[PDB]
């Protein structure tokens, strides 16, 4: 237990929370706009995972302003989560290399 780990953990928790909330809020914003395919929860969930992990298939994109704000939230949160976990891994390897040597 250090910090890079103790921050990657919080990033993971908060990402899970944002995927759930984004599913819910995306459904809540998409319903009411004719033509919206993003209007049930179980696929707002898989859409949130495909969007946060920057995959973007493109079969269930949001079509409203608030739905798109929710999408931007999910995108930024996922990018931050994974970049921060990458930083954590880098710090761990730096430590282990500052020991294979001395400094």
């Amino acid at each position, epitope marked *: 237990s250090a910090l890079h780990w103790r921050a990657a953990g919080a990033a993971t928790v908060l990402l899970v929370i944002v995927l759930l909330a984004g599913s819910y809020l995306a459904v*809540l914003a998409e319903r*009411g706009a004719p*033509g919206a395919q993003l209007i049930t*929860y179980p696929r707002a969930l898989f859409w949130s995972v495909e969007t946060a992990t920057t995959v973007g298939y493109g079969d269930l994109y949001p079509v409203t302003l608030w739905g798109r704000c929710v999408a931007v939230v999910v995108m930024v949160a996922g990018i931050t989560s994974f970049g921060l976990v990458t930083a954590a891994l880098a710090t761990w390897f730096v430590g282990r290399e500052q020991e294979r040597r001395g400094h």
Partner: antibody
Amino acid sequence: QVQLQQPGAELVKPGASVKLSCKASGYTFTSDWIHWVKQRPGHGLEWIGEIIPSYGRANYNEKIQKKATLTADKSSSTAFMQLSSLTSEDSAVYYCARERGDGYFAVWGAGTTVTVSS
Amino acid sequence: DILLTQSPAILSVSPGERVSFSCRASQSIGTDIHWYQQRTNGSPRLLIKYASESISGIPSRFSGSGSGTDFTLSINSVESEDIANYYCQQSNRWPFTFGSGTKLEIKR
């Protein structure tokens, strides 16, 4: 058991407002939407509007007359529809259905035979 | 919106026999179609969810199939209790829509 509970009938003089009530026992999740379905005599089913109570957001059939107003109630798990100022065309059995946010109407109510006549 | 067309509106069948209602959506919607039943002065009964999935309390008599734009609701061995009106309802794009309906007649 019986979960959605609707008054049997309503009579309104042609022009007033009518406020339909639908009360739900059983489970009440936060992901429950409440839909309304107008069924004219001799016609099929026609989707009117939906509302999520655990937030209070309502959508209304933008392709037919959008006179109504769906409202919610925090505790008792009861929803209201505000069909105000009608003609004699707005006379139908009005169903409320519960949807778990997964698209299909699991449970319906008994309906409310709403009658417009002087 | 999405147009659900149900041909024909009236379908007559002799008892103990396989009737097949049909629903056709105005654009591909995958399997987001759901079959309801309603008898005279009754309320809708969810028969099938997502094209081909069962509901508790629904007999094995009722099947359900199809995907994309064409969907089918079948009944092996019709019997008098099946005399009702059958609707399809889609949940793929907003708003949800219903079908025009279809009546089951039994020639006895």
